[PDB]
Amino acid sequence: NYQPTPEDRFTFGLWTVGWQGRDPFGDATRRALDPVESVRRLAELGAHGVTFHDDDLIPFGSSDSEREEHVKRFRQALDDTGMKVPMATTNLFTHPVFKDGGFTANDRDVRRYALRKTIRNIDLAVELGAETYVAWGGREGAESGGAKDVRDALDRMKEAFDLLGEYVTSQGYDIRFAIEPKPNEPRGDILLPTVGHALAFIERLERPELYGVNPEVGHEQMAGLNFPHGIAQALWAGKLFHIDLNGQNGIKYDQDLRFGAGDLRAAFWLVDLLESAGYSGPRHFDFKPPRTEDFDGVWASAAGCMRNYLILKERAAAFRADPEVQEALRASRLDELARPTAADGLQALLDDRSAFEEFDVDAAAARGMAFERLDQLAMDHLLGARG
Numbered sequence: 001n002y003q004p005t006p007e008d009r010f011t012f013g014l015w016t017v018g019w020q021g022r023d024p025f026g027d028a029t030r031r032a033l034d035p036v037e038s039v040r041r042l043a044e045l046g047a048h049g050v051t052f053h054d055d056d057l058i059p060f061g062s063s064d065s066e067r068e069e070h071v072k073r074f075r076q077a078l079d080d081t082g083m084k085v086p087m088a089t090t091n092l093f094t095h096p097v098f099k100d101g102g103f104t105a106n107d108r109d110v111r112r113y114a115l116r117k118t119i120r121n122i123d124l125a126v127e128l129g130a131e132t133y134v135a136w137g138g139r140e141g142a143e144s145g146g147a148k149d150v151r152d153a154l155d156r157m158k159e160a161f162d163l164l165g166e167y168v169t170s171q172g173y174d175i176r177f178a179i180e181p182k183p184n185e186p187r188g189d190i191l192l193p194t195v196g197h198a199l200a201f202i203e204r205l206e207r208p209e210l211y212g213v214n215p216e217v218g219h220e221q222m223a224g225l226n227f228p229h230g231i232a233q234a235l236w237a238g239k240l241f242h243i244d245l246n247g248q249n250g251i252k253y254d255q256d257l258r259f260g261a262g263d264l265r266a267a268f269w270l271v272d273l274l275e276s277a278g279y280s281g282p283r284h285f286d287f288k289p290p291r292t293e294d295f296d297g298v299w300a301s302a303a304g305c306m307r308n309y310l311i312l313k314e315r316a317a318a319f320r321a322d323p324e325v326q327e328a329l330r331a332s333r334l335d336e337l338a339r340p341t342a343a344d345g346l347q348a349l350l351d352d353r354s355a356f357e358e359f360d361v362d363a364a365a366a367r368g369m370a371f372e373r374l375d376q377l378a379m380d381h382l383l384g385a386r387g
């Protein structure tokens with residue numbers, strides 16, 4: 001089974017199945033894909049929608065005339081298939097003019113160009129129905145310590161995002177922004193390198209309600225961080241506007257493997273969390289079919305993204321529905337974690353001799369947490385071994 005349907009909200013970037021396979025040491029192994037063909041092929045696989053950078057859809061430098069005909073062709077394909085465009089973004093990283101960044105380039109004229117390029121694509125994204133506009137500052141950073149005053153760069157980053165919020169507000173657009181963190185690559189260090197740094201930065205913007213995060217599985221894992229934990233903090237703050245799903249094997253270059261590959265247990269706990277928290281946004285795959293593959297392998301890899309999500313959803317649901325797991329959760333006092341520590345208040349806590357003076361520290365220390373039996377039940381459910 002595990003057949004995806006549009007109700008599952010699976011989306012793909014044009015640049016994912018369309019990756020030609022050029023890497024830092026090798027030329028392209030696949031021919032370029034027509035965006036119209038990607039839309040139709042993804043619709044056949046059961047996808048909900050597609051996403052795009054401006055430069056995926058309209059070749060850079062296109063005249064106003066050529067730009068109109070690229071968009072027309074694309075909208076005809078969306079109209080024919082019923083495919084949605086829930087998110088769009090700007091390419092502020094490929095062209096050599098962005099080699100020192102877009103919003104935080106040292107040259108002021110580049111920063112102004114970056115803003116105009118972005119504003120132009122927001123207009124298009126809103127016209128096509130996008131609800132989220134993602135910013136990935138892939139070139140915002142440095143290879144050396146003196147090249148970037150990071151306090152001034154954060155001033156310029158705040159200035160850019162504040163201007164974008166003023167723009168969508170003045171136009172009455174119903175679109176929100178999501179910042180996508182990445183710790184490094186292609187810059188030696190990238191500004192706002194993790195979910196945490198991005199969440200903290202948003203709270204200093206003029207209109208923080210317009211901005212959230214687009215965390216990516218592989219990017220947090222490039223810092224050796226726990227991705228489900230970081231997603232939990234984003235949900236706790238009300239800022240999980242969008243998500244990038246893929247796989248990554250540890251701390252190394254950004255692999256963008258198909259979802260499910262890489263850290264499989266982390267994928268299980270991620271799906272458990274998204275489903276139990278009721279996340280309602282797109283399940284977006286930002287992945288690269290390996291350059292070893294031909295076009296048949298491209299579509300097998302894309303199908304695998306959706307299949308692995310659906311299998312993990314089933315296994316996490318069975319885990320949470322198992323009365324034996326519910327008993328284990330109680331034995332590990334997960335339910336006591338939900339209770340307030342001191343709803344009786346500070347003064348009651350201070351006068352509670354059972355909380356300190358008469359607290360039996362050795363009896364409490366002796367209690368086992370029973371975490372290993374709970375985790376083996378989780379392993380049994382993930383592997384379908386509950387028999």
Ligand SMILES: OC[C@H]1O[C@H](O)[C@H](O)[C@@H](O)[C@@H]1O
Nearest residue numbers: 015089134135136180244286
């Ligand atoms: O911002 C949208 C996308 O742009 C680029 O392709 C980045 O590599 C990817 O991580 C990001 O999700």
Ligand SMILES: [Co+2]
Nearest residue numbers: 218219254256
């Ligand atoms: Co990535």
Ligand SMILES: [Mg+2]
Nearest residue numbers: 180216244286
């Ligand atoms: Mg991404």
